Amino acid sequence: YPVFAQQNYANPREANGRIVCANCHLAQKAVEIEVPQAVLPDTVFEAVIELPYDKQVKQVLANGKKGDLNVGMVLILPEGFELAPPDRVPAEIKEKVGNLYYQPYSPEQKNILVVGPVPGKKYSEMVVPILSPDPAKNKNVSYLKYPIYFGGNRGRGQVYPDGKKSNFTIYNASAAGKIVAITALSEKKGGFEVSIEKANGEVVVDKIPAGPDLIVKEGQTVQADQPLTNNPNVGGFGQAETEIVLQNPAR
Numbered sequence: 001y002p003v004f005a006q007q008n009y010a011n012p013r014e015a016n017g018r019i020v021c022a023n024c025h026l027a028q029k030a031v032e033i034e035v036p037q038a039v040l041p042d043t044v045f046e047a048v049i050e051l052p053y054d055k056q057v058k059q060v061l062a063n064g065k066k067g068d069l070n071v072g073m074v075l076i077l078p079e080g081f082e083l084a085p086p087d088r089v090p091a092e093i094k095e096k097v098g099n100l101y102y103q104p105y106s107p108e109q110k111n112i113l114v115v116g117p118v119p120g121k122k123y124s125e126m127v128v129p130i131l132s133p134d135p136a137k138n139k140n141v142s143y144l145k146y147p148i149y150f151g152g153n154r155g156r157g158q159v160y161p162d163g164k165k166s167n168f169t170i171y172n173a174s175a176a177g178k179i180v181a182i183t184a185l186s187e188k189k190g191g192f193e194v195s196i197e198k199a200n201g202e203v204v205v206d207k208i209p210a211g212p213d214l215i216v217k218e219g220q221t222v223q224a225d226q227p228l229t230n231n232p233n234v235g236g237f238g239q240a241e242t243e244i245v246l247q248n249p250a251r
């Protein structure tokens with residue numbers, strides 16, 4: 001979730017340009033962002049973001065069942081740019097934005113906005129109302145070309161803040177050997193227990209939560225780290241970058 005980034009990373013963008021969501025949302029799926037090529041000072045403009053995905057394909061939910069995907073994003077604007085206050089957003093634009101609550105990455109970073117989780121079936125396309133700064137009022141800003149960075153995600157992550165895998169990723173064999181047993185991890189709650197007999201004779205048990213499907217069978221020999229399941233992840237994270245020129249009024 002965006003909050004996972006907010007709580008563990010002061011800067012959502014790394015030196016090489018990678019956005020932190022990518023540290024847990026391991027699959028890449030393209031996104032798009034569009035803004036006017038230029039904007040006048042103290043003016044409200046729109047950033048249109050696209051987080052496309054196949055709305056017919058379901059994901060594994062935290063409860064182990066299948067369900068719809070949700071989306072979220074982080075938008076890094078130049079210092080001086082901020083979410084446009086409601087009083088400055090035209091009714092026509094509020095209509096396009098919809099029932100969304102854009103929040104600052106932190107109270108001290110009003111130029112970085114996040115949103116989500118929100119339903120992907122409704123928000124695979126989102127509109128963000130932005131208020132441009134004013135050089136004649138702000139010294140830290142000039143009339144030049146500024147970059148805008150965007151990270152958009154759809155679907156649950158593969159790893160949690162504590163480093164533990166979610167039920168929405170691939171599970172692998174902890175050791176090499178022959179699968180001597182595969183049984184339910186519980187009397188309905190999904191999941192499996194895969195017993196692997198090592199060469200020395202020791203039998204290790206790999207626990208797999210409900211969600212992923214097995215691609216192995218009893219009697220089958222497996223090697224260390226070999227996938228025991230499919231990759232249930234049908235979502236993905238993507239990044240895009242654009243630019244906008246703060247235009248001088250000039251007259």
Ligand code: HEC
Pocket residue numbers: 001002003004005012020021022023024025059061062068069070071072073074114116117118151152153154155156157158159160161166
């Ligand atoms: C690892 C510490 C994570 C970081 C950094 C980010 N996300 Fe994440 N996200 C992660 C997990 C393990 C989960 C699943 C939670 C669960 O239900 O078990 C999520 C989930 C989301 C969601 C919801 C998706 C859905 O329900 O279909 C969204 C929209 C999402 N995450 C967005 C998101 C963004 C935009 C991030 C960067 C700003 C981000 N996440 C970072 C793990 C982690």
